DNA sequence: CCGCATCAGAGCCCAAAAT
DNA sequence: ATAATGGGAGCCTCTGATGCAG
């Protein structure tokens, strides 16, 4: 979000989920594939 | 900027690509009473045939905007991405196209008609079966979405 | 065991499985005393476990104890524990919290990116305490309990209240959100401008980062308190410092709609 | 049977108030009112006692409650605590 | 497996 | 924006320092009543009120200010901490 | 002292006794006429605490000077009411009972 | 104005009595109306004839009445009680033993009335049941998912009725049979009913290998009684295989006509499939003392012909319309009322094996309690049992044709996935598939269609016309989904030459697929398209033009349209918002002719042919369910003659009769200086000026006085400690006056309770000492305007105890009642929307002076983004708005029929027609072509819209066809770049408001357990901050804002009490401490028997309760 | 050894984080056999417990950053360069 | 030793919440 | 406080892990 450097203490594995969650709306294999995997 | 009836430009085009269509369509029926093609072949081609005057069709309406009418609003809209994408352009003005069966196996015969045009009570009620069954996917896809994130973040949350 | 709005009585669940519990403990100490054959003996004994089970997870083995004349389990201990309506997934890694309000939300072309507008009466109440003291330090009542008094009364509320209210909230951050809450930027930070009426504002360029239309959509408001949390807000959560998407690194507050059209 | 235990004799007399106008209220073909209950139930008995007497008999209700079709809902939700400041 | 049927 | 954020960004090897930095000297203001501040009177924050110009309450405002100046030190273990308390209650009182 | 640490163990029936402050010994809640809690019930004041803020039951010593004492009358410690939020009770069995966690 | 109607279709019949699904299903339960002899078994009568006679002794049933109602429907809505008729039973006591008979007519308590319009009122609120689908009894048979060549044969009955059966066959070759999830081989339950190895070799055997596979000898070993007590001890292991005990178990389960029910329909359709016909509704029979079998020989005949691949054997799809079937409110409460019988039949059975077997009559027998309690049990708490949706005429109209396959005896909301939310070819003509909510119901609940009827089996029935030959008669059948398959049906709009058959051609269905026919194969034709759709949908015109998922939206916001004060109806419509007025009952209309004596604000007299002079009052300014004033104006004048079955009165939401959900309004569709930002709406300040979009409103205030322990509480005008100020608009006794403004403070109704043992702390004792007042003995409790609510006070209701009428709830002395009332102009934040499913928040309110105008000075109303319709593919809105500007400049309103419509060259006459108007006026008037003008069609000409070279008359009207218009920016002066379309549309006022929406809380009410504040505005809650909002703030690292969140704002008690006084004292917030909620998990986990411990860094304990839980 | 996340997280060495997921008896009924202390390392259980999570202006790295204006640090640092 | 089966666990967020 | 009275009434779908079984 910075285009920079991260800086030391940012919550990284929440982004991380919060990145990955968020299109899991708009999956039409779809989501299935993604869960399965 | 303003959006009219008018505005929604069936394309020369569009009977032309009709014609062809319903000459290659009668050719594959006589290939199946008279036992060239099974049933399986038969539908396959027809849904092929459909596929291509859709894609046709559809750069036909593109074509006609940008040559003759440049500053037609859905195409301004469509094409600077403030609104609208080819296959919503192509059902206002063009045709809705293939429709699905409750199944999943899709219907031979699609809907010709564009929103402009005006759909019959028949090609409305085949289409209706899509809408459902696209509202019932997106219904429990939002669940198992929300419940895959909450496993996502108690994995990665320390 | 507390007594309603009615002077009627309303009670949790487990009063009810304990009552079980002691009968049956209290009944099987007198069969004992009383020197019972060893059939009544054991049927009191396995009931007393099964009272024991029923209190402790309730349904787990055997049939659920339930109230008479009505088919719902009684809430036990492990109920009350786990699950989505559980004592962890609904108090503890999430509460219902002080100092927040809601709104139906509006479009405010004129903000610029780090402004929302937020209706006065909303900003009034999520700032009580604040403008008491505001109140007391200029001179609109002569103490702290004469200015809540005279709040309470619409009619009694005079106008420079509002201009004392806009003293406190100078150089603040609010909080807005709109769920769900899919990534973090469901929250983002905006200095409030006060406005008359019932809808809040909000800037055209974070609708995407929300997901917000004008099609009905509300949204909350929380006040960060202390001078750290507000730092927090200010530095990290505003909406102007968050233009890049966290997940793919691209533009998040960008042209969109109208914006392009125009353009 | 009560969660708020009774007096056994109280009990007895409850139940007899309960008899009494459910014989009432299968002649009279309507619910009985307070008079007629107490009227029915003879001398020492007024509606003012007949009343008392159904208020002691009220037996509490679960703080959980479910309200609505969804089952994410208890009544002890809505209950205000009175008594810490 | 039934706490009635056991007993009777 | 927050005026200047990218060169307090610059500051800092972590964009957390910096809000623990800023909110730290923020609050030392606020209890000491702002005599303990290194800007100078036409550099203090000013708040337009219906009367006129007052100083800035907003004591986060002013400590992102002052960082901006120089005039502040930040880091860590550059003091005992009770220390600095009773030196600054000595020399800007409550 | 500051929390560092949160341990989850096994409780001996020792130990569930050395938490609680009282048996009960009866099903009973609250009188039916005074609302007050029955003596030995599930809301006994003797066992959980009084219900008004250094003020025992019967009203003998109704303020905080007195605030560890255990009224003679009525046997009500005078404290805080919170503490009807803390403090544990128990129960007797004739038979041991197995905890289902450990079976099921 | 003059109506215009297109269309060439050629309805034959009109649409049916739109709620006779709920009317004639009770009347067809109750059968009041019917003498007792003439009933028929069905409903409740068949309800009484299944419980009797009850056996010992027998008590047999005579016959029932049913009273008249106690109160009338106005009477009990004011008095919070139910409406409802006594039931009384006529019973017969007899005794087997000696020959005595008492008979004697018992009160069973009341039975709840369905008013004229479908609904119920239930405690004084009006309530509706919603019918339920579920599937059809019967025998089905499904393919086998395990093993691709074998079948599955399941048996299901009516709800309730009996157990599900399963006919799988086994991998080892014997058909089994499945019973309460038990399996054993089908082959020992046929031999106890009688059957021999010869009748299934005989019978079946062309079977070569599966007859042969049944077959097991050890089970012949044994006469049919041996064969009984062996099969019992495979269901109930333990319990002893005792004759009579064996015999009753498998008659209940099986045979007994008591016990098991297949349904009416389940008898027709397993009489239509297997080609039997059966002597009643049981699986078998009790006959000259042993078993004899009905269905179950003919389910194994067919799966076992089905297995080799007969002729004549089909799987059933068990979605069809035609074995799924409906339940409706007769259905449902009788399904209730049956199950409080057979509980006052416990009653009875016990009570005759007690109090000597001789000084009883049938009054002291029974007890009714269980009765009444089934009863008021479902109309109170039932999932079928909903609150009225009455917010305008239309919503409770639909709420009535609602049709949901949740509730007890359905899908659970978690229980269901998509086969049963599709839309079925079936749902043609009968369920609209439209209509249905959006989110997690989808497809569960639906709307009935248009034309749809539900049989007496409960089986959804459509009309068709008949055609003969090329000649289409004017005969309509109703049919049923399986019986439409068998024929071939053309569509409704096919050409036709009178009464023949105009096309070579037609376009029509067989078994819902399309195909191309030509006219000697049509056997029937539509009705019309308004049947394939609900009424809801039936209401949005140009549909054809809609995409499906807009539309949907279209036809439920129309049920949220508030009534508005200048109500009216659309322009353009289809032509059905006439006939919901007159069914849904809100429009007043008169019986006979004659003529009209009297007309009053309060009431209506009408003097008929008859001579008798019939008064129909009006009712004016009622609060229904959602708060929107329901009230009904005269239309009528002194002396006007009316005919029969002519407009009285118009109700809400109407105009002159027509559905009046909204407004007409003058719209422009374009892009306005980002305040049309992704679907908002800018308006004139205009609108406010005429009062457009302005709706009453009405919120209903209550309060008791009761005794209590400590004393009355008392309503009084005494209220300690308040000024005068503070009580002027106070009556005599403590009550607001009526005709009061009252704002959020105000007090409503003073109230008085007396003050606890709380009874003034020292602190409270040493001040009050000071100012020398006594401390009182009461507190004050008044009930106050909650924070944003208000209005003008226009009724009060008292009532007390010993006052005639009334007795309240025990302890209870006196209720108050205050009815405020507010007019709600449109403001920033309401929401509005058209039929076509464009929805927006109005977010500007611009003065007249800033709106875009036409030429000749006349301002928009509405200014809508074109950036909603194009990704939104709803088109009927655009054709909305140019026909609506011909009708603007021709002063017209239009019907154009769904499908049967306003087509676009005809929509293009009429515009030219307008043109007319809109300019030549002005060539007469004395205005030449504006500069203005030109400088626009210059830019329209670069467009391609009018043709290069003509006069600007001619491009003007080039452009008007169109649609577009000329229109001058307010601000500038200066043209719009561009022609732009406008025209007027219907637009309404959705239920949604901001007023009813905005809160605010700084601390409130909180949780008793857990300390958290409370939920919900009533409440004066706060907003729940989720789990997924705390991984917001964890993924900024914003730790001091969360923390504050988990404590100083929640549960925190020390925290949040001390965060507060540093706020009011002007320090900082202090760093917070354990919150308790935690502290209750731990104490949690103690109550488990485990030893939950916090611990230092030296892993000593660290007592978080402060030494209070320590002894 | 590949575990999917449901699986993982169930068996990460906090209980505190895995009763609070999901399978909550099981999962605390092990953790109580084993006499298990949960060191707080995640955010979950300072969530839980109402603590500054070790992550943002929370993390060790930033939190015990000090800071001194020079008219003091000077000042204080004067006096205490002596005996 | 390998399959089957049986049981017990999970299944989006917020607001309304018309009792 | 004493005729005699003797065994009960009742009802979705996914994935994952543990115990009997050709
Ligand atoms: N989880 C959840 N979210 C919902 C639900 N209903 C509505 N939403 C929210 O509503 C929003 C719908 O946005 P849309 O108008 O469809 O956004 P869009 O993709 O731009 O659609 P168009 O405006 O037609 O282009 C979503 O982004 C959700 O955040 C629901 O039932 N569950
Ligand atoms: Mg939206
Ligand atoms: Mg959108
Ligand atoms: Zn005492």
Redesign the pocket.
């Known amino acids: 979000s910075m285009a920079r450097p991260v800086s030391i203490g940012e919550a990284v594995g929440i982004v991380a989920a919060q990145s990955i969650g968020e299109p899991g709306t708009q999956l039409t294999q779809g989501l299935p594939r993604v869960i399965e995997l | 900027i303003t959006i009219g009836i008018d505005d929604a430009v069936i394309p020369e085009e569009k009977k032309q690509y009709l014609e062809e269509a319903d000459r290659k369509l009668l050719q594959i029926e006589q290939a199946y009473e008279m036992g060239f093609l099974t049933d399986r072949e038969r539908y396959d081609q027809i849904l092929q045939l459909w596929t291509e005057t859709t894609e046709k069709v559809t750069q036909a309406v593109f074509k006609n905007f940008e040559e003759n009418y440049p500053f037609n609003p859905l195409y301004v809209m469509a094409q600077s991405g403030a609104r609208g994408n080819p296959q919503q352009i192509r059902q206002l003005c063009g045709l809705r196209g293939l429709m699905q069966k409750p199944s999943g196996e899709t219907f031979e015969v699609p809907v010709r008609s564009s929103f402009r045009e005006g759909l019959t009570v028949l090609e409305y009620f085949i289409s209706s079966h899509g809408a459902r069954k696209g509202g019932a996917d997106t ?1 429990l896809r ?2 198992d ?3 895959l994130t ?1 496993k996502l973040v108690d994995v990665t949350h320390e | 065991m507390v007594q309603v709005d009615g002077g009627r009585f309303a009670t949790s669940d487990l009063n009810d499985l304990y009552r079980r519990l002691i009968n049956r403990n209290n009944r099987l100490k007198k069969l004992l005393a009383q020197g019972a054959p060893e059939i009544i003996i054991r049927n009191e004994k396995r009931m007393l476990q099964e009272a024991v089970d029923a209190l402790l997870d309730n349904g ?2 055997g049939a659920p104890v339930t109230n008479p004349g009505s088919d719902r389990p009684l809430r036990s201990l492990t109920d009350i524990l ?3 309506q559980g004592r962890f ?1 609904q108090n503890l890694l ?1 509460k ?1 919290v002080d100092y927040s309000g ?1 709104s139906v939300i509006v479009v405010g072309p004129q903000l610029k990116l780090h402004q929302c507008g937020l209706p006065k009466r909303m900003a009034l109440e999520l700032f009580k305490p604040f403008l008491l003291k505001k109140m007391e330090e200029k001179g609109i009542a002569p103490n702290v309990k004469a200015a809540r008094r005279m709040l309470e009364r619409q009619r009694d509320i005079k106008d420079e209240v509002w201009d004392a209210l806009e003293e406190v909230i100078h150089g603040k951050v609010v909080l807005l959100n709109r ?2 809450t899919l990534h973090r930027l469901g929250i983002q930070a905006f200095q409030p401008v006060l406005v008359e009426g019932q809808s809040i504002q909000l800037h055209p360029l974070v609708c995407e980062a929300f997901n917000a239309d004008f099609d009905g959509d ?1 949204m ?1 408001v929380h006040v960060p308190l202390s001078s750290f949390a507000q730092a927090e807000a200010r530095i990290q959560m505003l909406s102007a410092h968050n233009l890049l998407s966290p997940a793919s690194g691209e533009p998040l507050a960008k042209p969109s709609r109208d914006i392009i059209l125009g353009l | 049977a009560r969660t708020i235990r009774i007096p056994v004799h109280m009990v007895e007399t409850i139940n007899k108030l309960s008899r009494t106008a459910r014989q009432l209220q299968q002649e009279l073909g309507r619910e009985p009112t307070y008079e007629e209950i107490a009227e029915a139930m003879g001398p020492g008995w007024d509606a003012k006692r007949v009343e008392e007497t159904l208020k002691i008999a009220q037996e509490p209700v679960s703080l959980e409650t479910p ?2 079709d ?1 089952k ?2 208890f009544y002890g939700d809505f209950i205000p605590d009175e008594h810490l400041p | 497996s ?1 706490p ?2 056991q007993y ?1 | 924006a927050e005026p200047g954020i990218d060169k307090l960004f610059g500051m800092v090897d972590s964009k957390y320092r910096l809000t623990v930095v800023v909110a730290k000297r923020a609050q030392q203001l606020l209890r000491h009543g702002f005599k303990n501040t290194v800007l100078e009177p036409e550099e203090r924050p000013k708040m337009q009120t219906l009367e006129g110009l007052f100083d800035d309450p907003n004591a986060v405002t002013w400590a992102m200010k002052e960082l901006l100046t120089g005039r502040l030190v930040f880091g860590e273990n550059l003091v005992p901490e009770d220390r600095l308390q009773k030196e600054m209650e000595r020399l800007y009182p409550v | 002292k500051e929390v560092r640490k949160v341990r989850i163990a096994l409780a001996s029936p020792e130990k569930i006794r050395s938490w609680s402050y009282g048996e009960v010994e009866k099903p009973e809640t609250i009188n039916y006429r005074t609302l007050k809690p029955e003596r030995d019930g599930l809301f006994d004041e003797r066992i959980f605490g009084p219900i008004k803020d250094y003020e025992c039951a019967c009203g003998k010593y109704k303020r905080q000077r007195f605030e560890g004492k255990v009224c003679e009358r009525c046997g009500v410690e005078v404290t805080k009411s919170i503490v009807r939020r803390y403090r544990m009770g128990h129960i007797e069995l004739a038979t041991p009972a197995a905890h289902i966690w450990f079976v ?1 | 104005m003059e109506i215009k109607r297109f269309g060439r279709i050629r309805e034959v019949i009109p649409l049916p009595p739109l709620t006779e699904i709920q009317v004639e299903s009770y009347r067809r339960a109750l059968q009041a109306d019917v003498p007792p002899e003439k009933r028929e078994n069905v409903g409740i009568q068949a309800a009484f004839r299944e419980t009797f006679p009850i056996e010992e002794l027998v008590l047999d049933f005579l016959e029932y009445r049913l009273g008249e109602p106690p109160f009338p429907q106005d009477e009990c809505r004011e008095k919070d009680l139910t409406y409802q008729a006594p039931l009384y039973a006529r019973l017969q006591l007899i005794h087997k033993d000696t020959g005595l008979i008492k008979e004697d007519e018992v009160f069973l308590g009341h039975i709840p009335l369905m008013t004229e319009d479908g609904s119920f009122i239930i405690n004084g ?1 009006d309530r509706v049941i919603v019918s339920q689908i579920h599937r059809s009894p019967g025998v089905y048979f499904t393919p086998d998912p395990a093993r691709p060549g074998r079948y599955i044969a399941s048996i299901i009955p009516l709800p309730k009725r009996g ?1 599900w059966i399963d006919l799988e066959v086994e991998p080892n070759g014997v058909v089994s049979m499945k019973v ?1 999830k038990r399996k054993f081989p089908l082959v020992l339950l046929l031999r106890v009913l009688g059957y021999d190895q010869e009748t299934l070799a005989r019978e079946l055997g062309a079977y070569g290998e599966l007859v042969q596979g049944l077959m097991d000898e050890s089970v012949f070993a044994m006469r049919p009684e041996e064969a009984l007590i062996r099969l019992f001890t495979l269901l ?1 292991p ?3 295989p005792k004759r009579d005990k064996a015999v009753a ?1 498998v008659y209940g389960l099986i045979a007994d006509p008591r016990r098991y029910d297949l349904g009416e329909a389940g008898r027709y359709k397993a009489e239509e499939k297997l080609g039997i016909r059966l002597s009643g509704r049981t699986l078998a029979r009790f006959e000259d003392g042993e078993f004899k079998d009905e269905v179950f020989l003919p389910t194994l005949r067919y799966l076992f012909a089905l297995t080799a691949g007969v002729p004549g054997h089909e799987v059933d799809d068990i979605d069809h319309l035609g074995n799924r079937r409906i339940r409706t409110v007769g259905e449902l409460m009788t399904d209730q009322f049956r199950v409080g019988l057979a509980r006052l039949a416990r009653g009875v059975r016990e009570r005759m094996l007690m109090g000597s077997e001789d000084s009883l009559t049938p009054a002291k027998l029974v007890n009714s309690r269980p009765l009444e309690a089934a009863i008021r049990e479902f109309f109170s708490r039932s999932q079928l049992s909903q ?1 009225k949706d009455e917010t305008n005429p239309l919503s409770s109209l639909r709420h009535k044709r609602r049709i949901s396959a949740l509730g007890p005896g359905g ?2 909301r ?2 269901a ?1 998509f086969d049963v939310r599709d839309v079925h070819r079936t749902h043609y003509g009968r369920i609209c598939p439209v209509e249905t909510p959006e ?2 119901n989808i497809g569960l609940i639906t709307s009935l269609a248009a034309y749809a009827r539900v049989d007496e089996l409960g089986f959804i029935r459509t009309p068709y016309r008949r055609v003969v030959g090329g000649v289409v008669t004017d005969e309509v059948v109703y049919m049923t989904a399986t019986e439409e398959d068998r024929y071939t049906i053309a569509q409704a709009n096919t050409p036709l030459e009178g009464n023949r058959i105009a096309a070579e051609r037609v376009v029509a269905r067989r078994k819902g697929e399309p195909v191309i026919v030509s006219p000697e194969e049509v056997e029937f034709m539509d009705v019309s398209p308004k049947q394939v759709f609900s009424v809801n949908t039936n209401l949005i015109p140009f549909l054809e033009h809609d995409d499906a998922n807009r539309a949907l939206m279209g036809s439920n916001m129309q049920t949220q349209a508030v009534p508005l004060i200048r109500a009216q109806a659309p322009v353009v419509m289809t032509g059905l918002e006439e006939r919901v007025v007159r069914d849904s009952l809100a429009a007043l209309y008169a019986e006979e002719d004659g003529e009209v004596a009297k007309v009053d604000g309060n009431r209506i007299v009408v003097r008929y042919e008859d001579g008798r002079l019939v008064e129909y009052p009006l009712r004016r300014f009622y609060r229904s ?3 929107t004033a329901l009230d009904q104006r005269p239309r009528v004048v002194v002396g006007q003659r009316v005919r029969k079955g002519d407009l009285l009165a118009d109700g809400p939401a109407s105009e002159n009769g027509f559905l009046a959900l909204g407004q007409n309004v003058l719209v422009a569709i374009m892009p306005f200086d980002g305040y049309n930002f992704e679907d908002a709406i800018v308006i004139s300040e205009e609108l406010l000026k005429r009062d457009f979009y302005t709706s009453i409103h009405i919120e209903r205030y209550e309060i008791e006085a009761r005794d209590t322990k400590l004393g009355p509480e008392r309503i009084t005008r005494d209220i300690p400690h308040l000024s005068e100020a503070a009580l002027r608009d106070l009556d005599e006794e403590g009550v607001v006056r009526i005709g009061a403004e009252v704002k959020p403070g105000d007090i409503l109704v003073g109230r008085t309770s007396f003050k606890g043992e709380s009874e003034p702390t020292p602190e409270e004792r040493l001040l009050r000492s000071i100012f020398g007042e006594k401390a009182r003995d009461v507190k004050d409790t008044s009930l106050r305007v909650p924070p944003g609510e208000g209005g003008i006070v226009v009724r009060t209701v008292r009532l007390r105890r010993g006052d005639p009428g009334v007795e309240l709830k025990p302890g209870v002395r006196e209720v108050v009642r205050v009815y405020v009332a507010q007019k709600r102009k449109l403001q920033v934040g309401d929401k509005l929307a058209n039929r076509h499913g464009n929805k927006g928040v109005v977010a500007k309110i611009l003065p007249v002076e800033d709106m875009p105008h036409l030429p000749d000075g006349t301002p928009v109303d509405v200014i809508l983004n074109p950036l909603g319709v194009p990704s939104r593919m709803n088109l009927g809105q655009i054709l909305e708005t140019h026909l609506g500007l011909a009708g603007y400049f021709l002063g017209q309103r239009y019907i154009s029929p769904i499908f049967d419509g306003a087509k676009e060259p005809e929509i293009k006459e009429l515009l030219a027609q307008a043109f007319e108007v809109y300019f030549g006026k002005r060539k007469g008037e004395g205005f030449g072509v504006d500069k203005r003008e030109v400088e626009v069609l210059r830019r329209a000409e670069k467009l391609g819209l009018v043709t290069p070279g003509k006069t600007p008359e001619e491009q003007l009207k080039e452009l008007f066809l169109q649609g577009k218009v000329v229109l001058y920016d307010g601000r500038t002066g200066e043209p719009i770049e561009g022609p732009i379309v406008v025209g007027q549309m219907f637009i309404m006022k959705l239920y949604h408001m901001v007023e009813d929406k905005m ?1 605010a809380r700084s601390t409130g009410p909180y949780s008793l357990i857990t300390q958290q504040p409370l ?4 409440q004066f ?1 706060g ?2 901050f ?3 909002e705390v991984w917001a703030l964890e993924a900024y690292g914003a730790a001091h804002t969360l923390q504050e969140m988990l404590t100083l704002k929640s549960d925190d008690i020390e925290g949040r009490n001390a965060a507060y006084e540093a706020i009011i004292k002007g320090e900082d917030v202090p760093e917070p401490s354990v919150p308790e909620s935690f502290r209750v998990l731990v104490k949690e986990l103690q109550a488990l028997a485990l030893d939950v411990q916090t611990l230092d860094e030296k892993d000593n304990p660290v007592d978080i309760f402060e030494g209070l839980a320590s002894k | 050894l590949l575990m ?1 996340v449901t ?1 993982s997280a169930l068996s990460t060495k906090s209980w505190l984080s895995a009763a609070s997921f ?4 099981h999962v605390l009924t092990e953790a109580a056999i084993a006499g298990k202390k949960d060191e707080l390392i995640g955010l979950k259980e300072n969530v839980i417990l109402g603590r500054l999570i070790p992550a943002g202006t929370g993390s060790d790295f930033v939190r015990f950053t000090q800071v001194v204006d020079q008219k003091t640090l000077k000042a204080i640092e004067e006096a205490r360069k002596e005996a």
Request: proline share 5%.
């Open positions: 219904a939002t669940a979405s929300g419940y909450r | 787990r083995r786990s699950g989505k997934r999430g219902r809601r769920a769900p509300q909350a | 309200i609505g969804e994410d809902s | 039934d009635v049927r009777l | 099921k | 609120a157990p309460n109930r333990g319990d002893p178990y609150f899908l659970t978690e229980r996935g989110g997690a369910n959602q708060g809160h939920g919900g505005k009533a809650g907003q729940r989720g789990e997924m | 999917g699986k999901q399978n909550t008896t």
